[model samples]
Target: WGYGKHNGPEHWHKDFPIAKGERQSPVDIDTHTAKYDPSLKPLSVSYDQATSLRILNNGHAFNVEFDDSQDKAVLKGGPLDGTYRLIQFAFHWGSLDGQGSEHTVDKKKYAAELHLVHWNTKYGDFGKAVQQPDGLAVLGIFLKVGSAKPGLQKVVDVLDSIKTKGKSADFTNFDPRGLLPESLDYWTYPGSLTTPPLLECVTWIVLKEPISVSSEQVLKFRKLNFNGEGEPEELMVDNWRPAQPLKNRQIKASF
Candidate 1:
């Protein structure tokens, strides 16, 4: 069971119901400064059919997982010692103004957010990957509402192919690097997924610069299907999480 705007971030736990021991990801990440190493660069990526990838209709969002055998990339040296698999990726957005994104920077909210999730191949599988400190790495990029971001157009162009729930479009010969910023400088820290079952082994790399997207483009994302049944009828409402306590986490930026 997932939740939306009416049962938004603030009341999500109440709507879905979770056990006391259930791990969850927090939304807010303060205590960060723009200070970091500039030598870090994004890993080179390559994918093939043998690489397994699946798009999951999780009600709240659509998650795409890349098969480790089919694709591979190197994350340089920071945490993990080997290559990482592009496990899955997803997005977060709002239904309207004053209600779009989950992560706020300097107390400012964006219109939407995108996360490119990857797992340390050194662990063999995603389940095993989550157990190690270098198990996972997520690239978080903010999307502001206004002019359409040129990079985002590639994703929006495919919306028509996956508009319905449970409906997935095979994006063969697709290169995800086009979706990333040219600069590799970012803020790094330990965090969990933005959703439930929030394992704590995530190495978060939040970009300093936000991308742009048109209001209409955002509307298209908000209109995504929420049901796992692939029904075109059930539209996703609010998909953003409320800001969470940062606890004592220190955000280290690479500038």
Candidate 2:
């Protein structure tokens, strides 16, 4: 529905006025100055591996959607006041190395960035939750080139099935925790969704440690087409939004 120039983040403010909002997402993480909060607890994740419903290509990026009706797949603790149920997960990457990911640190970019988006339980559904200031929570983890990540392969292996926009395929019995880093340390702050509507309702929890994925797997993201089969084929790469100003937002660290 949106592209890089007029419709994307570059000129999204013409529609959603908050496009220029100070607390926009994908901000550069300045960890050196980030304050450590001892009060923060480790993330309490309880995701039913079988809840991994299916995967789809939404013309923007690939999303691994989950069954969020029950409280079976939820994230609590660590900067969150109430339980936030896992709705879906997506990624932002580049066509080449050292040019991907949204959130960078010390000007260093990663091969890719994975976003596990969740919505607060009290609001019932994601559609309603986003309207509130504290309605959503997005957990971002960086992906770097290394040995093949065996666990994450379960999700990447199905990309070929959803190569075109609007395409979807069965991707069941998948577990997201296997893709997480060994440590739960993260940087937290209030920010907006990195996409359109630019709703400033996200509580961002960015992991300090990155997960490993082979270059071949990273290339899989580019193979997916942003446009449908009938429409002009646009390569689905470089889908990340540019980092916005930090403004007065303070990024808290949980170590």
Candidate 3:
């Protein structure tokens, strides 16, 4: 259940047997092997700052939840045929600066990774969408350590309030559009949720250009406690699942 020696990714298959299923996510993207498709359209995002609801430490990572009652914020185009409504976004990082990202390119890792989880509109809700193979779409953005990102700083600023596992704070009027890189170019593949259940329902859209984060800022995430209130502190770190095997799957590039 945790990212430790006995309860880490290696041991997840014992409880969640789907961890070994085909099309599992966070796979290493070999750029040279990815095929460029002309049919790929430019990715589009329309987000209302008001949709941001709260930020919480979900034991594994800190997540910023959104009000998905309506399609106020959504993802469209690129590899998707229709629009997908945004639900929540989360981050994954390592204990250190060198390697934190779940998806890597050419064997290169980043300081952290961001996931913007969305559910298909055709399906009624996130609960139903998560069970369908084409129901969920995740936008994966890699974070490299360098200068501090102003957009990301807004999210980092609230971390102190939610240091405990189940703690949460009001995080509103936050638009995640600022967190994206200059280019919308990306790699699309069939993958699953990086965490438990490991459902093969995610259509991963991983951006090629990574946004920047400061060394000092990225290190702050490690201060979050994985253990909840009244328990001994276990700083949350290395919460990412390792790259899985890409069997019978071809990654398509949207250049």
Best candidate, lDDT-wise? Answer: 3
Whole-model lDDT values for every prediction: 0.64, 0.87, 0.91
Alpha-carbon runs more than 4 Å astray in model 1: 5-24, 27-56, 78-81, 228-234
lDDT of 1: 0.64
The predictions' CA RMSDs to the true structure, in order, are 4.0, 1.4, 0.9
Strongest candidate by TM-score: 3
lDDT per residue for candidate 3 within 176-206, as digits (tens), equals 8889899989999999999998899999999
lDDT of 1 by residue, 61-100 (tens): 7665555563463344443356666766788877775566
Ranking, lDDT, top scorer first: 3, 2, 1
- 2 versus 3: better lDDT goes to: 3
lDDT of 2 by residue, 1-255 (tens): 376565666777777788897788878888797889999889887875438889999889989988987887788999999999899999999888887889998779998999999999999889999999999999999999988899888877889899998999988888888888898889999998998878999999999999999988897778889889788878988888889999999888996
* TM-score, every prediction: 0.78, 0.96, 0.98
From the highest TM-score down, the ranking of the candidates is: 3, 2, 1
